[PDB]
Amino acid sequence: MTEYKLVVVGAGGVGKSALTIQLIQNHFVDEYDPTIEDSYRKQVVIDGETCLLDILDTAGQEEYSAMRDQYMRTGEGFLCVFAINNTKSFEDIHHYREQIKRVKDSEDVPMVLVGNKSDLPSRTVDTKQAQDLARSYGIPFIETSAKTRQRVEDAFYTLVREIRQYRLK
Ligand SMILES: N[C@H]1CC[C@@H](N2C[C@@H](O)CCN3/C(=N/S(=O)(=O)c4ccc(O)c(c4)C2=O)Sc2c(Cl)ccc(O)c23)CC1
Ligand SMILES: Nc1nc2c(ncn2[C@@H]2O[C@H](COP(=O)(O)OP(=O)(O)NP(=O)(O)O)[C@@H](O)[C@H]2O)c(=O)[nH]1
Ligand SMILES: [Co+2]
Ligand SMILES: [Mg+2]
Known part of the structure; x- marks a missing residue:
């Protein structure tokens, strides 16, 4: 059966765990039980x-x-998550993308740019900015809310499709 190794990466507090737990449990994470790194x-x-x-x-x-070098080597597709209320988390996507490409020695690595926390009014990263950046990178861009479950499935399944398209190359 086909297996895809997906990796959710991003700056602290952007909602990596909340997106993953929403896909897995269909439930929104509690702050009183912080998620530990796991697969x-x-x-x-x-x-x-x-x-x-x-x-x-x-x-x-x-x-x-x-474990960063190992997960980047093993990872087949990366969900590059920033939060729409955190400009540094968005700017730092540059650094994470560059490190993944470096570790994997590849200019083409399956990736999706995800702007999480789309429910928050306190937006500091405009949608158009992130869209244009994703176009520059040649990857899909999806805005999500782990809190409301908006586009969570779409984010992960789009990444699978990007890996499928890469495997066809
Ligand atoms: N649940 C327990 C036992 C497992 C511990 N892990 C996570 C381990 O399952 C991850 C396996 N793994 C990987 N193993 S790994 O040695 O690189 C690793 C990376 C980060 C980790 O936190 C762990 C292992 C780990 O300790 S890479 C990877 C990818 Cl790219 C996708 C999916 C994966 O499952 C995956 C966490 C505590
Ligand atoms: N409003 C809102 N808050 C969210 C959303 N996703 C996560 N949060 C909140 O963001 C905080 C961190 O969430 P978490 O998913 O743990 O982030 P992380 O990116 O996994 N953190 P860490 O880097 O430590 O692993 C929590 O307070 C969580 O409730 C979202 O879509 N909307
Ligand atoms: Co750089
Ligand atoms: Mg987390």
Whole structure:
């Protein structure tokens, strides 16, 4: 059965865990139980093809970690998450994308840019800005809300499709 190794990356507090737990449990994370870095398995059918998603929800990029090179080597597709209320989280996408491409020694790595927390009025990153950046990178851009569940499935399944298209190259 086809297996896809997906990695959710981004700055601290952008909602990497909340997006992952929404896909896995259909439930929004509680602040009184913070999610620890872990992987999750979920079998889904996308465009009539069955597959197993193995998703690694990573710690914030500024948090301490010894597994970044290994997850970037193993990862087949990356969900590059920023939060729409955090300009640094958006600007730092540059750094994460560059590190993934460096580790994987590839200019073409399946990626989706995700602007999370779309429910928040306190927006500091405009949709158009992030759209244009994604066009420059040649990747899809999706705004999501882990809180409201808006576009969460779309974000992950779009990434699977990007990996499928990459495997066809
Ligand atoms: N649940 C326990 C045991 C497992 C611990 N892990 C996470 C481990 O499952 C991840 C396996 N793994 C990977 N293993 S790994 O050695 O690189 C690793 C990276 C980060 C981790 O937190 C762990 C392992 C780990 O300790 S890479 C990877 C990708 Cl790219 C996608 C999906 C994956 O499942 C995946 C967390 C605590
Ligand atoms: N309003 C709103 N808050 C969200 C959303 N997603 C996550 N949060 C909030 O953001 C905070 C951090 O969420 P979490 O998912 O743990 O972020 P993370 O990116 O996984 N954090 P860490 O880098 O430490 O692993 C929590 O207070 C959570 O409730 C969202 O879409 N909307
Ligand atoms: Co750079
Ligand atoms: Mg987290």
